[PDB]
Write a protein that binds this ligand. Structure first.
Ligand SMILES: Nc1nc2c(ncn2[C@@H]2O[C@H](COP(=O)(O)OP(=O)(O)OP(=O)(O)O)[C@@H](O)[C@H]2O)c(=O)[nH]1
Ligand SMILES: Nc1nc2c(ncn2[C@@H]2O[C@H](COP(=O)(O)OP(=O)(O)OP(=O)(O)O)[C@@H](O)[C@H]2O)c(=O)[nH]1
Ligand SMILES: Nc1nc2c(ncn2[C@@H]2O[C@H](COP(=O)(O)OP(=O)(O)O)[C@@H](O)[C@H]2O)c(=O)[nH]1
Ligand SMILES: Nc1nc2c(ncn2[C@@H]2O[C@H](COP(=O)(O)OP(=O)(O)O)[C@@H](O)[C@H]2O)c(=O)[nH]1
Ligand SMILES: [Mg+2]
Ligand SMILES: [Mg+2]
Lengths: 435, 429, 435, 429
């Protein structure tokens, strides 16, 4: 009765959605065809139901290249999705923000908004939106900027959560990542309620070091991020000793309107062969969450200050142990919050344990904790992008595509100014107060 | 969707195209009769990008074979994998360009270009959502060069939005298969830098050396070289002809590899390349392919990359692999060769990954490097041109068709402007 | 005991009748030979019965070209029709109104009226007439004008409903459509109780987009229109929670004597493969009916004002939900009725669900709703015809056929004046009142 | 019902008619003996529109074969499919018109026309509800032209209500099979614009070009051309000889295609036209036929439509198809060729659809275009006429039969009036 739709833009969004919906169907014992042989309703928040025992997701799959969507239509989760949700374009933006925001996406945006409005009106207690999109791809950045603007125009005050894929400092599959990233950030900065920074480089490191898988496929990273998002929405979708809604997330983790970029982290992540030999203490897993090597963004947290933290626990958890572990974390020195925020934690506890996907890589654990942490180290990452942008702009490289596809140079200058202003605000927050 | 149209100009173009369509049909499991006997639905899920489903459940290539002489056309037609082309596409003339570019672009080509454009237009209207065109030709022969340039100009007039690919066989540095090829090469380059989205420079000398040294073949027939180039092109398009963990299309490659409108000339490369016996004695690992694709001895353009800088680089893999492995390999290769890359373009490697190997293999790879080394090529040609133009040798043959000296003056000036730009961006800071 | 005959004029009329009578025979479990192996009598309103278990339709099939009627006589519904009802001419009017109204039809009109009078006198509680005819064909327009004049002369005050086929703005199979359309409208404007605008272009669009059939045959459009008409007469032919007669239709949907041109719309229309994945909410299907893309006339309703609406529901329907959905519709802004009519709805509810024809294209649905809507946007359509007429009259094209076949030019001028007057009245209604 | 009577004048008329009746019988499954051996009842449901059921269950064509010489008549009679005509219909003379129109319309024809009209009247009375007449003739030969014009005038006197079709073989622009054909053509056109409901202009040159280029036949015998024209006529009538989702008749076509009484000359066209080998290599789709029927290279009248405007257009399909597909194709073709149509006639395409293909095929199509391009034809002829009339060449041959110069003066004046009207309506606004 508290619904929240899902929106998947771009190839990354669609693949992540594949993983996430596999995980959901496993959580609620739902067949790929929508049938089903502590639980409350629970699945009602993400599954709508027809007369028969068939349930459908509240998701929208939009892309400009029909390849991946066609794979979904042919995927084992074929009978699941309502066929109208699979909006396919004809020619992808091809890692060009201008195409993805002015030329191509502009011509299906209306149909996308139509389906969005249909699914919204069919629901009653709509909590908000979940956007799954990359950052470098043309469709992702462009269509996402357009979609966020449209939604903010239409649905003024409702939850809008985003899951970007922060481009890695060194592993850049595309070449024009800085341009698209800068443009999409400069645009989305005034509409997104709360983003969720995740990067593939950190996930590679985590998969190799912890899970002891040397050669991972994109499916594995998708499984990890799906686990994170499932932990995020378990509070809505399940009964817990201390529940929490997305509104609480945006309220607690966003001190200033512009600074709403918290990074993700999850634990425990160990191989099934290594499942034993460790009791998985709640304080232990909390320390694991706070370790710089277990974070999912390549940024040393010791270089910044945790402006806010949100720890969400599920499984056999007891509040006093959580309190003790959090107090111990506060005692440590290298974790220095901002002076003006003495209360740097919101906690969430759930009874439903995390579910391990058969054919997966993780081990069945009795407890799990996801930390969404808004820190100051992320500012440094922006600097890197800044740097690259200047380079690719000092020579006016690649500019002609963007210019000829519905954009002006002053827009690029303005986006650079906006990113510089954001970095300035981050520094301004980083200082301490007098008196 | 994203239907692609194939044009083959000149004798080399036609031979390469014949081998190419052979390879493509082998990939999709297409009988020589043109009907499907394959085994995997994914073959026919995107068969429409290159083929048209003629009635009674048959398939025809969406190609347009062009020539000014019936010889090689008929040779192909008689050969197997020839009886599947739709016969109306075989446009050919009788006079023959006589290895002259003036004939191929002013006098002789101006009479067939209209019918060629008509067939082009018919095919375009047959397609649902056109993606772009790929032209297969040479730069020395009169027909290929001249008529291809003419068709490119006309098409770009009729389609200023679609994408354009050219697979030109650039003249070798050492040998010279013809005598007047500098003139045709210069004029063709003029028209290409005018109205081409991307150009894939290829030399027969490098292919000779690769077949001899790497593959250990002392008897390379032209069939082998054409097979190699066709494998390269098929690997280029497989990113859209098949699903992939990180798919790419022609438009993405054009966006990533062309920072500036004129600087759209690419040297390709392929891997792995193993002998018949020396294959099992090597591990087929992503690092192995990656290191193979970065060296002088595996570039299909006769120019040592170390002489210049890699402005941009694209790489398309196939088959099942681990993305993190590719990422680490690209990172290492960009770190170790720091002096070989442009400073102001960080992370200058585009990556695409397919799910299907090109058959027979577990994993393959295709490299498309836009470097500053290739300028040497042009430099060489330019010099030669000046020589042959200073004494005005053979000048009368081109003059007699209406062309004038100022044409060559302008073309050489344009080429030197391009060379200046390439050098300027090589030592940018 | 409330009879209503059916009259099919022209090729379109006869084919539509084929579909409609197939649908009826399926509704009441009637064999093609009139035998039969919630229901009341029900079929008595449209089927008469002889001594044996054989029932016949109360229909008249009249045409001037024996081709299609001969096909009917050879059709699988051969034993059904009483042979006298199949009146066949010898030479069709050949898309010439003059032939269809002065020369040929004038010589069988008496026999047609004779059969009409026989079937009328055999019935007792005759509600009215159902005319099925195209608009462009010579027989349709001409014979229909003649028939309406004759019926109005004979049967003064009885229901006379028409189902024209409005010529599409761009898809015109004939060439002389404007002439015949203008003439037949100028004539029928003073006799027809209520027309029913439907066009083939809109049905093409609906079949492709909704039913996902790219290459439809005329049979499919005929099935759709038959479903519409069955929904129209289900109230007479079945027991419902709120029944309604054709007299109520003409009373409610006709504010002014000249303006009696309501357009049709039907829902739900989805493929059987898409039958699932949507629960078919009553409010949902109401919104579907009100969507401009689901209407069966190529006219954007947002360009006009709904002077009246009539929503007829059948199946598992509950009045309160209907009331709620209608209130929600009234709340919306883009649906702006005329100020002087604050009550823009008449509702009808039936218990009998719509029946899907085996070998059909639609899916078995539990609820259905047909909207007959009299709006102001239709005026614009007349303008288009006006335009074309002027063109074909500015050069006096094709005039000689009509002149030499029993007509005068002043008649054409008069028809143009009448159409202009109708458009003027539409505009006059379109204005708002002072004080 | 709607019985149709067939008249065949001149040698060309008789040959075309023989091929035509061959085709019709093949459609209806009629043995050469004239008895039915077919398989589908629909064949005999409307067999009566063209055939008469003679007793003992046989069928005879409702044709009237006319000539002034026994040669071609006897040739046909001896040939197969000849022994089914009722012998009394073979009216022929002995003198022969000598390729002169004066003989064919004043002296020689005036002696047989009475018997011809008697047989016509007998056949008319045999019919139940007469639909109209179709005349098959040429315009060059004396017999065909002259006697056909005479019969047309007489019939229109005796039947001012029925419908009249003429299939005239117009002289080719380039070649001239005879020498005096301008005179006969002018006089025949005079009589046609006088008293014909519709005229189907056809040239042998265009048929030559179609057979050679499209069908890839270097050896076109007259049988082939007559084969094609007969297929065209059969496709014209199949809309009433068979059921259809949107049926049409001759009267409908006359109504739709003749906005003004004089402007009733039509250029026909047919599709699809494929070679023997090049057939399976193409999809037989409604868009394909539609685009095929709109181009210069498929018009049976030697005049590029682009030189003028399509005043009106009719199109008759066959076989099972989807109406929406046809509608969309007509919409697209009218949109893309906006400059090629009359402004003040919106939606100028008449559509008819049959249920039976013409045998062997899945779907066919026939096009009947009334354009302003054809005026060029007349212009050409007019000019030639003036030339041959300025020197009064051959004038004595026509003079000797009672005709006078004022006859030619009036005919040329009438033709120029028609040309002026055609041009006037071409550039109307
Ligand atoms: N974490 C994760 N990221 C992915 C996955 N698949 C693709 N991506 C991201 O997608 C990016 C590739 O470009 P995309 O954003 O997918 O571009 P697109 O979605 O295809 O849209 P276009 O640019 O218009 O083609 C890479 O930078 C990856 O980070 C995946 O399975 N997991
Ligand atoms: N919706 C629909 N319309 C049809 C169908 N069949 C024919 N029509 C309409 O019929 C028109 C063709 O002319 P008609 O009105 O049928 O002419 P006719 O009924 O044959 O009468 P005549 O003009 O005298 O020959 C087209 O404009 C179509 O709109 C059908 O199956 N469904
Ligand atoms: N790589 C390759 N090059 C070829 C082949 N055949 C011809 N060529 C090249 O094509 C050039 C000859 O051009 P050609 O098309 O025959 O002359 P044209 O008729 O004037 O266009 C020569 O320089 C050859 O190097 C081939 O099979 N493979
Ligand atoms: N298309 C076609 N035209 C023919 C055929 N036979 C003759 N003709 C034409 O008929 C004309 C000769 O007329 P003809 O009837 O023989 O002379 P007539 O006896 O005076 O009427 C020539 O111009 C030919 O072009 C034929 O089989 N097909
Ligand atoms: Mg994409
Ligand atoms: Mg009719």
């Amino acid at each position: 009765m508290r619904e929240c739709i899902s929106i998947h833009v771009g190839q990354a969004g669609v693949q992540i959605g594949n993983a996430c919906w596999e995980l959901y169907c496993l959580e609620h014992g739902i067949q790929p065809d929508g049938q089903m042989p502590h639980h409350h309703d629970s699945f009602n928040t993400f599954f709508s139901e027809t007369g028969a025992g068939k349930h459908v997701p509240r998701a929208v799959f939009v892309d400009l290249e029909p390849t991946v969507i066609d794979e979904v239509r042919t995927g084992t989760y074929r009978q699941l999705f309502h066929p109208e949700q699979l909006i396919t374009g004809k020619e992808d933006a091809a890692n060009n923000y201008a195409r993805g925001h002015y030329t191509i996406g502009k011509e299906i945006i209306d149909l996308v908004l139509d389906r969005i409005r249909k699914l919204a009106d069919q629901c009653t207690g709509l909590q908000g939106f979940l956007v799954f999109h990359s950052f470098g791809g043309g469709t992702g950045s462009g269509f996402t900027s357009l979609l966020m603007e449209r939604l903010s125009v239409d649905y003024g005050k409702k939850s809008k959560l985003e899951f970007s894929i922060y481009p890695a400092p060194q592993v850049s599959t595309a070449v024009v990542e800085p341009y698209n990233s800068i443009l999409t950030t400069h645009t989305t900065l005034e509409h997104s309620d709360c983003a969720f920074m995740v990067d593939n480089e950190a996930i590679y490191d985590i998969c190799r070091r912890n899970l002891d898988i040397e050669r991972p496929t994109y499916t594995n990273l998708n499984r990890l991020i799906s686990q994170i998002v499932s932990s995020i929405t378990a509070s809505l979708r399940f009964d817990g000793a201390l529940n929490v809604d997305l509104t609480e997330f945006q309220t607690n983790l966003v001190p200033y309107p512009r600074i709403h970029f918290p990074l993700a982290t999850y634990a425990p992540v160990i191989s099934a062969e290594k499942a034993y030999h460790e009791q998985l203490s709640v304080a232990e897993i909390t320390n694991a969450c706070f370790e710089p090597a277990n974070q999912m963004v390549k940024c040393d947290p010791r270089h910044g200050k945790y402006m806010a933290c949100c720890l969400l626990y599920r499984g056999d958890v007891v509040p006093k142990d959580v309190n003790a572990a959090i107090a111990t974390i506060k005692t440590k020195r290298s974790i220095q919050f901002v002076d003006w925020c003495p209360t740097g934690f919101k906690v969430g506890i759930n009874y439903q344990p995390p579910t391990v996907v058969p054919g997966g890589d993780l081990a069945k654990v009795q407890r799990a904790v996801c930390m969404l942490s808004n820190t100051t180290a992320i500012a440094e990452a922006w600097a890197r992008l800044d740097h690259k942008f200047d380079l690719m702009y000092a020579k006016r490289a690649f500019v002609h595509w963007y210019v000829g596809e519905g954009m002006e140079e002053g827009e690029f200058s303005e986006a650079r100014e906006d990113m510089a202003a954001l970095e300035k605000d981050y520094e301004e927050v980083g200082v301490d107060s007098v008196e | 969707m994203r239907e692609i149209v194939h044009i083959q100009a000149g004798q080399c173009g036609n031979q390469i195209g014949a081998k190419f369509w052979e390879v493509i049909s082998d990939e999709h499991g297409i009988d020589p009769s043109g009907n499907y006997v394959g085994d995997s639905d994914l073959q026919l899920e995107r068969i429409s990008v290159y083929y048209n489903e003629a009635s009674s459940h048959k398939y025809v290539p969406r190609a347009i074979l062009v020539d000014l002489e019936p010889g090689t056309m008929d040779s192909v037609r008689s050969g197997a994998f020839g009886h599947l082309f739709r016969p109306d596409n075989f446009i050919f003339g009788q006079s023959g360009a006589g290895n002259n570019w003036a004939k191929g672009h002013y006098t002789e080509g101006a009479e067939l270009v209209d019918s060629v454009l008509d067939v082009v237009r018919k095919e375009c209207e047959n397609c649902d959502c056109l993606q772009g065109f790929q032209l297969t030709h040479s730069l020395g022969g009169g027909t290929g060069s001249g008529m291809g340039t003419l068709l490119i100009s006309k098409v770009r007039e009729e389609y200023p939005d679609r994408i354009m690919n050219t697979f030109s066989v650039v003249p070798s540095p050492k040998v010279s298969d013809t005598v007047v090829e500098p003139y045709n090469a210069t004029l063709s380059i003029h028209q290409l830098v005018e109205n081409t989205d991307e150009t894939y420079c290829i030399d027969n000398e490098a292919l000779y050396d690769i077949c001899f040294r790497t593959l250990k073949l002392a008897t390379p027939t032209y069939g082998d070289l054409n097979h190699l180039v066709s494998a390269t092109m098929s690997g280029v398009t497989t990113s859209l002809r098949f699903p992939g963990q990180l798919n790419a299309d022609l438009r993405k490659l054009a966006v990533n590899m062309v920072p500036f409108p004129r600087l759209h000339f690419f040297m390709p490369g392929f891997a792995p390349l193993t002998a018949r016996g020396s294959q099992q004695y090597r591990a087929l690992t992503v690092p192995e392919l990656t290191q193979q694709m970065f060296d002088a001895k595996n570039m299909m353009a006769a120019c040592d990359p170390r002489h210049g800088r890699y402005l941009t680089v694209a790489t398309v893999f196939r088959g099942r692999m681990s993305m993190k492995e590719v990422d680490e390999q690209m990172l290492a290769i960009q770190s170790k060769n720091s002096s070989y890359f442009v400073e102001w373009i960080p992370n200058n490697v585009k990556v695409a990954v397919c799910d299907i190997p090109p058959r027979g293999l577990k994993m393959s790879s295709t490299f498309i490097g836009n470097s500053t080394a290739i300028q040497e090529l042009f430099k060489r040609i330019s010099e030669q041109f000046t020589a042959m133009f200073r004494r005005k040798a053979f000048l009368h043959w081109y003059t007699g068709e209406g062309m004038d000296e100022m044409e060559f003056t302008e073309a050489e000036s344009n080429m030197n402007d391009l060379v200046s730009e390439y050098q300027q961006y090589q030592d940018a800071t």
